[PDB]
Amino acid sequence: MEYKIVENGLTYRIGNGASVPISNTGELIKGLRNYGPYEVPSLKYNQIALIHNNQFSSLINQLKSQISSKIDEVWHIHNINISEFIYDSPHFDSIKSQVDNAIDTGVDGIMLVLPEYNTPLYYKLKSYLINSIPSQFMRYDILSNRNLTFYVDNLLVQFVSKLGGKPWILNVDPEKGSDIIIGTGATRIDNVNLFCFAMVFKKDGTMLWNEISPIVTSSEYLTYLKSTIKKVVYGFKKSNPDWDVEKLTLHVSGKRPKMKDGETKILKETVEELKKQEMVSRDVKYAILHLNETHPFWVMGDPYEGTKVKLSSKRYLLTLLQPYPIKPLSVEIVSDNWTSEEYYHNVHEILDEIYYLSKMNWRGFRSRNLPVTVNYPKLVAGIIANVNRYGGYPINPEGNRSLQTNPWFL
RNA sequence: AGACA
RNA sequence: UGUC
Ligand SMILES: [Mg+2]
The missing domain is CATH 3.30.420.10 (Ribonuclease H-like superfamily/Ribonuclease H)
Incomplete structure (x- = not known):
């Protein structure tokens, strides 16, 4: 042997020709804040839909505002509005209809909160969305026993990419x-x-x-x-x-x-x-x-x-x-x-x-x-x-x- | 389905 | 079963 x-x-290359070392999440996020991601997605409507059945839950709320400030401050996507859509039953058809409403209102992306594990539902909705628009699914029962900060930081990395963004590339x-x-x-x-x-x-x-x-x-x-x-x-x-x-x-x-x-x-x-x-x-x-x-x-x-x-x-x-x-x-x-x-x-x-x-x-x-x-x-x-x-x-x-x-x- | 061993 |  x-x-x-x-x-x-x-190193990673991010926005405006800046570099950050790898394997150091701290300096990556600091770099994103100052220089932006390698490529900021161009959004048509500057609009994301948030689709869930949670009331006026104070959790959808800290979430909403954390998404909102980070998408802007970390990712440099400006003037973004999150509109919310609520569905009765956690059944397919009921969620789909809130999907369609969101869509014909003109959205660049859909974030969809599911209540629990439920594989046939998940893959049926994800399948629909993938043919329609960029999507980021979520589970409320995971969103409840996770520190918001960690969950959102990560969630956005892939949602920005699905929106056509390029967080960082290799140098x-x-x-x-x-x-x-x-x-x-x-x-x-x-x-x-x-x-x-x-x-x-x-x-x-x-x-x-x-x-x-x-x-x-x-x-x-x-x-x-x-x-x-x-x-x-x-x-x-x-x-x-x-x-x-x-x-x-x-x-x-x-x-x-x-x-x-x-x-x-x-x-x-x-x-x-x-x-x-x-x-x-x-x-x-x-x-x-x-x-x-x-x-x-x-x-x-x-x-x-x-x-x-x-x-x-x-x-x-x-x-x-x-x-x-x-x-x-x-x-x-x-x-x-x-x-x-x-x-x-x-x-x-x-x-x-x-x-x-x-x-x-x-x-x-x-x-x-x-x-x-x-x-x-x-x-x-x-x-x-x-x-x-x-x-x-x-x-x-x-x-x-x-x-x-x-x-x-x- | 925030993810990673 | 753990990590942020
Ligand atoms: Mg994913």
């Missing part, structure tokens, strides 16, 4: 890392049932385009996986047409058919064709990686964040979070296009990249033990699946630009 630590001087070296990173693969709905996903990222960690395949039979996996990728690269190029792609990386993950060696060839085929369709430089350097969780990592005898453990020249363990125990990410170099002189240098770039992408979750102020390239699609699968199992409204990427371009799944 041989190991190397990721170079540990790196990247233009030279090092991939031009784009494609998170790809599939997750199991049922046992005969598959959906494929393909999501394109910039090395600063921002999602550019998101494509999802039809819920399809497991047999036809290798078909829609190849299909879906092409579609992401198509939709990304039409949107970024003068952007030469010389370094491509694939991040393959999710619970999918166990047909690996054949999965590999087809991703190679998918690339060669993208070359010949002049969507990617004719001499693209690329790598195809499997990222997987594994067993917790124990250093014995009496493990720093960003530690890269070489299990073999194709397999690495990468630690994403400080042990203060730790589940690392398993990263396999399944296939590549690299000369051998480069190779070692390219591996570590690609492992550094993964480590940085793990600091890029927009669900809140604490980032997941995953790179966004694996986490985001996992949250997709999350929603697509329950929308299947609970009879919600189908989610359709082709049919409008905002779903292919916004992190609706946070």
Whole structure:
């Protein structure tokens, strides 16, 4: 066992060219207050609806005003009004109607307070909203035993993003890392049932385009996986047409058919064709990686964040979070296009990249033990699946630009 | 469904 | 079962 630590001087870029170090929520929020987030969403109506059945509850109220002052002071979204809508019974139809009222009054976003756990209701409403407008759900029974300050700080991180905002991105070296990173693969709905996903990222960690395949039979996996990728690269190029792609990386993950060696060839085929369709430089350097969780990592005898453990020249363990125990990410170099002189240098770039992408979750102020390239699609699968199992409204990427371009799944 | 181990 |  041989190991190397990721170079540990790196920063987020927020508003007005300011930088803040990572892993320090204090200086991030202070930075946001002064400089604003990297990109302030443009809202049409300057209006958010708050939809709940709580009376004149003094809780909706401290909430309301905390949302209100933070959205303005932390996020720099000005002149925002929150209108409230109240529903009789916590049943679907009753809440939906308050959704529709809100909508035809002209709202940029809906915050929806549910009373308790209730999975069929939640996924039915979320499904409706995702096709309609950016949404942030809430539970009153969680909102009651949590410190408001923590709950709102975090809640807004992802609500701002769903509104098209960009809280913060990575400060990247233009030279090092991939031009784009494609998170790809599939997750199991049922046992005969598959959906494929393909999501394109910039090395600063921002999602550019998101494509999802039809819920399809497991047999036809290798078909829609190849299909879906092409579609992401198509939709990304039409949107970024003068952007030469010389370094491509694939991040393959999710619970999918166990047909690996054949999965590999087809991703190679998918690339060669993208070359010949002049969507990617004719001499693209690329790598195809499997990222997987594994067993917790124990250093014995009496493990720093960003530690890269070489299990073999194709397999690495990468630690994403400080042990203060730790589940690392398993990263396999399944296939590549690299000369051998480069190779070692390219591996570590690609492992550094993964480590940085793990600091890029927009669900809140604490980032997941995953790179966004694996986490985001996992949250997709999350929603697509329950929308299947609970009879919600189908989610359709082709049919409008905002779903292919916004992190609706946070 | 505020999230994170 | 914990953390803010
Ligand atoms: Mg969420």
